[PDB]
Amino acid sequence: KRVDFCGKGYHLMSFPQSAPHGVVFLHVTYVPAQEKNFTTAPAICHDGK
C-alpha cells in the first residue's frame, strides 16, 4: 500500500529472478489513462436534507 515502493503506480504483484550476485524483481503495475472533465458537486439537497 505504501506508494512508489515496488513499481511506479498502483502495485499488483511481483516475481523474483536470480542473478550472478543479486536478485531481479519484475513488478506488475496498473496505470490509468483516457480521462475526461465532467462536473461535480459536494452533496445533494432534497426536501431540506
Place this chain on the structure above:
Amino acid sequence: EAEVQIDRLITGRLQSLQTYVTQQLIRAAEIRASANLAATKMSECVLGQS
C-alpha cells in the same frame, strides 16, 4: 645524507593524508543512509498518505 631525513617527512604526510581519506569515507557512508530515509519519507508522505 638528508634524503633519509626527507623520508620521514614523506611518510608523515602520507599517513596524515591516509587518516583524512578514511575519515571522509566513514563520514560520507552515513549521509547516504540519512538521505535514503529522506527520499523514502518524501515519496510517501508527500505523493500520498501514510
